Amino acid sequence: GSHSMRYFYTSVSRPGRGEPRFISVGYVDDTQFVRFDSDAASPREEPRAPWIEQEGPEYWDRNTQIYKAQAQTDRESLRNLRGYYNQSEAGSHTLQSMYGCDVGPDGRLLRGHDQYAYDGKDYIALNEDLRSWTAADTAAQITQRKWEAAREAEQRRAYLEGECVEWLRRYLENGKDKLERADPPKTHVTHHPISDHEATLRCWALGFYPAEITLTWQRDGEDQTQDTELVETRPAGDRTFQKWAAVVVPSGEEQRYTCHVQHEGLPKPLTLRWE
């Protein structure tokens, strides 16, 4: 199937309380597989998925050194960006980084990503050509000129086309069914009387992977878009996801309603009812 790998960095300054906190997480598709936290007792890259545990000591060592160095680089970046924006040296600010690769079924690169936000706002991004930058403002143009002179885009491109693709292919080989085979939802409908004249029908999807899903209530096979309460997809805590959709219906009309479930793990879309 098509797959992605992503790394997410968060640096948060705390002037007067020491160096910024740096946190990294890595994902393949919707599965988190590594973390690093600069405030940990002995900071190191740590496994968060079973299939990464087989990587040897040289892997964990190289990555730990990278995160430690990137934390110091982000600390310098935060100093520079409060300077660019003429901000107080007393306040806490956030630098987020998000990068990785999207591959097709053959494992070839479809798209590379390398982009940044300062205090929750897009700041600079590597363009789809992996050769040029888009800067949000004159501050971000200082960064852009620095990175153009340092040939940063070529460094990002070499990673995105090389290590990103090759290591994602490896993780997919080692993760096998956990990463390649979607886990369909376990589904049920519940019924909750509100009054003598109204009841809630709730359609549940539990234990599914990946997170992408569609739940819709139909009355006589027509979508009830404007009348469905839909909760945001949420993690179960065991790497799988949950969602539900509810409709309030007249008592005795429940038979007219069906819940439609679309998920990659299902052989075909499900039609459920209160039963």
Binding site: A150, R156, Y159
Partner: peptide, 9 residues
């Protein structure tokens, strides 16, 4: 595996 560190901004 992660990318090697960037130049600072």
């Amino acid at each position: 595996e992660p990318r090697x560190p960037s130049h600072s901004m």
